[PDB]
RNA sequence: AGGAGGUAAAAAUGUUCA
RNA sequence: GCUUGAGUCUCGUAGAGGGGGGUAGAAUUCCAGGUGUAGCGGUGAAAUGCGUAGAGAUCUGGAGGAAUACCGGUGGCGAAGGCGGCCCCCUGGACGAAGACUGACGCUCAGGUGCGAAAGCGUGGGGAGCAAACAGGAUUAGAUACCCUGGUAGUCCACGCCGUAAACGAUGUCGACUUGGAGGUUGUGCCCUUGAGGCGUGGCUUCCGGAGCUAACGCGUUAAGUCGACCGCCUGGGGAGUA
């Protein structure tokens, strides 16, 4: 339903935790594209963003930490 | 005795049994009760009603310590899991916060092929 | 994998000028430049099988051209094999 | 030369000794004509999860542009320097300078 | 280079030669050499205490610096030698002040590299430095037990010990067998592993191949008479006895470890 | 995975657990590995899913109801 | 409407041609 | 000679394409220690097994090995086999844009050469989990099976070998032509980005379907439609893909 950088093109950064936490559930899971209404190309960069930020301890792997 | 104020209840609900133990916030256990020791041998061993009396018989044996509020950490899927906490709600305790600590791996070791 | 300056050097050397980039002489030398550079890659690793198939392709693409050049112009063909250093 | 977006976290206590370190790493880089773009020192913030123990570490972003040889010089000073824990280097994409 | 020979004769058809083309094909450094006679397995009393020893090719002793007491004097690896008293190869290094010494040659160490010892060593193979300067999880060799003692563990071909944990003044290492020893933190260790790891791929082939290594024919106890070996006797290869040594001690499963003064350091026994 | 409803709740009301996973992935990583049926049964999953989508746009008959 | 948990231990054989 | 075949050069784009080196978190098992106590585990039921030496459960710490949850989708890439945690180095191919260049250098290809899941074989390491063989307990008329508890090779790594699969869209490869509808994915140009966009232009890809085609099922612009070039292959069943 909703849209994002698909119209107002921008590069999804991993240091940006503000826009990044919208795509993360309370458990610490990556939400599917079939919900957020994002494009496939921007989704993959976003998935890579989560994995990079998770490595740098900016986002939790799970909520049992 | 020690008279511990608070405590954390743990529930290990598997598919064929449920062993509910009550410990404090530091991890040191203070008593437990199983559905396998409350009679119920076999088919009844994996039932929510058996999970009910397990929570009741664990509500006892911790009387020496008398804990007011209780944190709940349920673990694993199965027949109990929900009837053990509702029975523990009516047990008299003060359920603080209920959580789910199921051990989900990130595709670690390989699970069996069994069952046909 | 042939940086732009290396590509620009050989192209304006084996042909007429920078305008000449598709002639047969140009192609053979430019492909040989990639193979000579890629020789270092398969010196080690030895198991990068997928990229090798890319090498064998340009190897035969070179051989298709040389057999064309000999069949069309043995004059320039003889001068190309001596300037590039191949053809036993 | 290629751009880099290295990010390395240092130990909490050793954050009192970190400022001099940034200027030490950059010196070897510009010594090899490596241009620097950012130097954004975030500061000691919370670690979402325990790393070898002790959370709340100090973050340092560098955003460097340098030759390929000087970075392995730089990342080897990360493995064997136990003050700095969990380093990470990245790709170019024409290094930027603004976000925090 | 694990090269297998060609059968031009029986006894040469199974031989697998391990050749290293980088080994100096000349003579070793004369000053660092000294004679080394053969015992023959005979002690002070002249009796053969250790059986199966004698003959072999005459070899000289190359004094190898295991200790590594030089600090902050960068040396360069000149050439790789062949040592008939080891299993690994020895590198003839040259220091800055003109000193020449023999050291064990690690895996990645080609003639022309630069090594150094001391606490100011960079973490690079060949460099020797105390274990509280070496990162935990690293791989070392030629490790000591007592500070400045010399280095006993992991010294043969393709051998190495792993620093598994470090607590205070005691660093626990995981030896090559699987033992989990404890050690003084002042014990110097050399980074990397011991080179020439392809040594174990070598097969001797001839019976004489072993004869010039110094080994000597080993006779099975079953072939003997009862007066020589507990096994002995028989009238057609009979045994019917629990396997033992020539001295009546049960072999094949019977621990002989009994030190008790050094088990304080040993954490876990091999398995 | 973590609920409080801080003070006045007095009832479980945890629908949040089933919303994450808790059982769908446990009765999946329980047994039966295969490495084969995944691509088989999930190619089977959306095969029938597109046809329920097809008759979604194909129930325009009369039938009289 | 859209998605998750649970739902059958044991039962073999049947001559030939039409 | 020429250019619409083919190939090359300049600029960008997407991707589990490939090889090598490090790194991370969850979890399983094992080990040491504290709390604490009669069961635990398993199943249709049960038993073997583990357990008062003190398990299971719980908490702290440690060691390993293997696999990468979510993202993940009839999504992407590769000749095929097949490949997905993160990062770095080396490196192949494909596509698009506006042009220039060479000038038919092409298509196919017996023999030949290389790659080629898994299982298996050799040398040397590794070994948590899973698990042939095997053992034990059941089920049973019997059960050298299905089920349960254990468990070796193997599964993992490096270097060779083997060359086989329902290696399958059961559809050889290249090229031309012949109505459409709805989605997915990745480039590109123009218009008011006036607002999650509108209209054309390419590659790859999924489902439904027209003519035609087919024995029928079904295929249907990625054809099994209409043609061309070359290659491989079949000639009743079994014997036998054996001697």
Task: From E73, E130, E68, select the one nearest E103 (Cα to Cα).
Answer: E68
Question: Is D26 inside a domain boundary?
Answer: yes
Q: Can you read off the two tokens belonging to residue E41?
A: 């397995």
Return d(Cα E124, Cα E135) in angstroms, integer. Answer: 12
Return d(Cα C15, Cα A32) in angstroms, integer. Answer: 55
Q: Min CA distance, F1 vs chain A (Å)?
A: 7
> Within this chain, do residues E83 and E183 fall inside the same structural domain, yes or no?
no
Beta bridge partner(s), residue B100: B74
Domain boundary among E194, E215, E238: E194
Question: Is D23 inside a domain boundary?
Answer: yes
Question: Is D100 inside a domain boundary?
Answer: no
This structure's resolution (angstroms)?
3.0
- Which residue's CA shows the smallest distance to C1' of H7? C22
> Within this chain, do residues E27 and E76 fall inside the same structural domain, yes or no?
yes
> Within this chain, do residues E164 and E64 fall inside the same structural domain, yes or no?
no
Q: Can you read off the two tokens belonging to residue E176?
A: 């090559």
Question: Is D99 inside a domain boundary?
Answer: no
CA distances from E68 to E90, E134, E150, E153 (A): 14, 16, 8, 15
CA E168 → C1' H98, Å?
A: 70
Q: Can you read off the two tokens belonging to residue E3?
A: 């090269």
**Strand H lies under 7 A from the Cβ of residue C32:** no
Kindly report the CA angle at C18 between C16 and C19, in degrees rounded to 5? 75
Contact A63 F20 (CB under 8 A): no
E strands, B1-116, are 7-13, 18-23, 29-34, 69-75, 94-100
CA distances from C33 to C36, C85, E171, E252 (A): 5, 11, 55, 65
Question: Is D8 inside a domain boundary?
Answer: yes
Beta carbons within 8 Å of F43's beta carbon, 6+ residues apart: none
Nearest chain A residue to D45, by CA: A58
**What's the domain count of chain E?**
3
Domain boundary among E142, E171, E194: E194
**Strand H lies under 7 A from the Cβ of residue D80:** no
Beta carbons within 8 Å of A14's beta carbon, 6+ residues apart: A20, A48, A49, A50, A52, A53, A56, A58
Task: From E131, E167, E135, E149, select the one nearest E267 (Cα to Cα).
Answer: E167
DSSP class of residue E215 equals B
Return d(Cα C60, Cα B113) in angstroms, integer. Answer: 49
Contact B113 F33 (CB under 8 A): yes
Determine whether B56 is exposed, middle or buried from the number of CB atoms within 10 Å of its CB (0-12, 13-18, 19+). Answer: middle
Domain boundary among E78, E113, E148: E113
SS (H, E, C) chain C: CCCHHHHHHHHHHHCCCCCCCCCHHHHHHHHHHHHHHHCCCCCCCCCCHHHHHHHHHHHHHHHHHHHHHHHHCHHHHHHHHHHHCCCC
Return d(Cα D53, Cα A56) in angstroms, integer. Answer: 15
Beta carbons within 8 Å of E110's beta carbon, 6+ residues apart: E22, E77
Return d(Cα E160, Cα E106) in angstroms, integer. Answer: 10
Q: What top-level class would CATH report for the domain C1-88?
A: mainly alpha
> Within this chain, do residues E56 and E73 fall inside the same structural domain, yes or no?
yes
Task: From E138, E121, B58, E139, select the one nearest E130 (Cα to Cα).
Answer: E121
> Within this chain, do residues E142 and E48 fall inside the same structural domain, yes or no?
no
> Within this chain, do residues E170 and E211 fall inside the same structural domain, yes or no?
no
Question: Is D77 inside a domain boundary?
Answer: yes
**What's the domain count of chain D?**
1
> Within this chain, do residues E190 and E201 fall inside the same structural domain, yes or no?
no
> Within this chain, do residues E133 and E165 fall inside the same structural domain, yes or no?
yes
Return d(Cα E189, Cα E185) in angstroms, integer. Answer: 10
Q: Which residue has the tokens 């058809």?
A: E13
Nearest chain F residue to A30, by CA: F20
Domain housing D61: 1-92
Q: Which residue has the tokens 């990162």?
A: E135
Return d(Cα C22, Cα C68) in angstroms, integer. Answer: 14
Say if CB E215 and CB E52 are below 8 A apart.
yes
> Within this chain, do residues E137 and E235 fall inside the same structural domain, yes or no?
no
Domain housing E157: 117-194
Question: Is D97 inside a domain boundary?
Answer: no
Q: Can you read off the two tokens belonging to residue F54?
A: 């097809």
> Within this chain, do residues E87 and E24 fall inside the same structural domain, yes or no?
yes
């Amino acid at each position: 339903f909703c849209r994002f950088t698909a119209e107002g093109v921008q590069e999804i950064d991993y240091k940006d935790i503000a826009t990044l936490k919208n795509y993360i559930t309370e458990s610490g899971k990556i939400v599917p594209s079939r919900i957020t209404g994002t494009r496939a190309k921007y989704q993959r960069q976003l998935a890579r963003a989560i994995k990079r930020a998770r490595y740098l301890s900016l986002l939790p792997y799970t909520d049992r930490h | 005795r020690k008279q511990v104020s608070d405590g954390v209840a743990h529930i290990h609900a598997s598919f064929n049994n449920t062993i509910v133990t009550i410990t404090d916030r530091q991890g040191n256990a203070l008593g437990w009760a199983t559905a396998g020791g409350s009679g119920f041998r076999g088919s009844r061993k994996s039932t929510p009603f058996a999970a009910q009396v397990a929570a009741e018989r664990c509500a006892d044996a911790v009387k020496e310590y008398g804990i007011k509020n209780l944190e709940v950490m349920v673990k694993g899927p199965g027949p109990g899991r929900e009837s053990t906490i509702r029975a523990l709600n009516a047990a008299g305790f003060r359920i603080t916060n209920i959580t789910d600590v199921t051990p989900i791996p990130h595709n670690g070791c390989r699970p069996p092929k069994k069952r046909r | 994998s042939l940086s732009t300056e290396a590509t620009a050097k050989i192209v304006s050397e084996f042909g007429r000028d920078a305008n000449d980039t598709g002639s047969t002489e140009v192609q053979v030398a430019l492909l040989t430049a990639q193979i000579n550079h890629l020789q270092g890659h398969f010196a080690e690793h030895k198991k990068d099988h997928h990229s090798r198939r890319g090498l064998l392709r340009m190897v035969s693409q070179r051989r298709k051209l040389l057999d064309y050049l000999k069949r069309k112009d043995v004059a320039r063909y003889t001068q190309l094999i001596e300037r590039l250093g191949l053809r036993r | 030369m290629r751009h880099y977006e290295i990010v390395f976290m240092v130990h909490p206590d050793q954050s009192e000794q970190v400022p001099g370190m940034i200027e030490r790493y950059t010196a070897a880089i510009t010594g090899a004509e490596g241009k620097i773009h950012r130097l954004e020192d975030w500061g000691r913030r919370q670690l979402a999860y325990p790393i070898n123990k002790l959370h709340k570490a100090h973050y340092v972003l560098m955003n460097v542009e340098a030759p390929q040889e000087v970075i392995d010089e730089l990342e080897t000073t990360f493995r064997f320097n136990d003050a700095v824990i969990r380093s990470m280097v990245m790709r170019t994409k024409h290094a930027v300078t603004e976000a925090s | 280079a694990v090269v297998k020979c060609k059968p031009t004769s029986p006894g040469r058809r199974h031989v697998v030669k391990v050749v290293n083309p980088e080994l100096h094909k000349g003579k070793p450094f004369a000053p660092l050499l000294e004679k080394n006679s053969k015992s023959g397995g005979r002690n002070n009393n002249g009796r053969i205490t250790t059986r199966h020893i004698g003959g072999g090719h005459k070899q000289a002793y190359r004094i190898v610096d295991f200790k590594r007491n030089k600090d902050g004097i960068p040396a360069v690896v000149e050439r790789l030698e062949y040592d008939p008293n080891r299993s690994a190869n020895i590198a003839l290094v040259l220091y800055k002040d003109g000193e020449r010494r023999y050291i064990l040659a690690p895996k990645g160490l080609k003639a022309g590299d630069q090594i150094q010892s001391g606490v100011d060593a960079a973490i690079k193979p060949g460099n020797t430095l105390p274990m509280r300067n070496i990162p935990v999880g690293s791989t070392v060799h030629n490790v000591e037990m007592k500070p400045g003692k010399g280095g006993q563990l992991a010294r043969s071909a393709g051998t190495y010990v792993q620093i598994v944990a470090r607590d205070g003044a005691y660093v626990t290492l995981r030896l090559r067998s699987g033992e989990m020893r404890k050690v003084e933190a002042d014990c110097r260790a050399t980074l990397g592993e011991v080179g020439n790891a392809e040594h174990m791929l070598r097969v001797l082939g001839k019976a004489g191949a072993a004869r010039w290594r110094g080994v000597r024919p080993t006779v099975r106890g079953t072939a003997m008479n009862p007066v020589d070996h507990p096994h002995g006797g028989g009238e057609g290869r009979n045994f019917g006895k629990h396997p033992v040594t020539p001295w009546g001690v049960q072999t094949k499963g019977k621990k002989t470890r009994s030190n008790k003064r050094t088990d304080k350091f040993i954490v876990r026994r091999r398995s | 995975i973590k609920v409080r409803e801080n003070e006045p709740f007095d009832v479980a009301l945890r629908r949040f657990k089933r919303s994450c996973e808790k059982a769908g992935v446990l009765a999946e990583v329980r047994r039966r590995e295969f490495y084969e049926k995944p691509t088989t049964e999930r190619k089977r999953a959306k095969a029938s899913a597109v046809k329920r989508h097809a008759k979604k746009l194909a129930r325009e008959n009369a039938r009289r109801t």
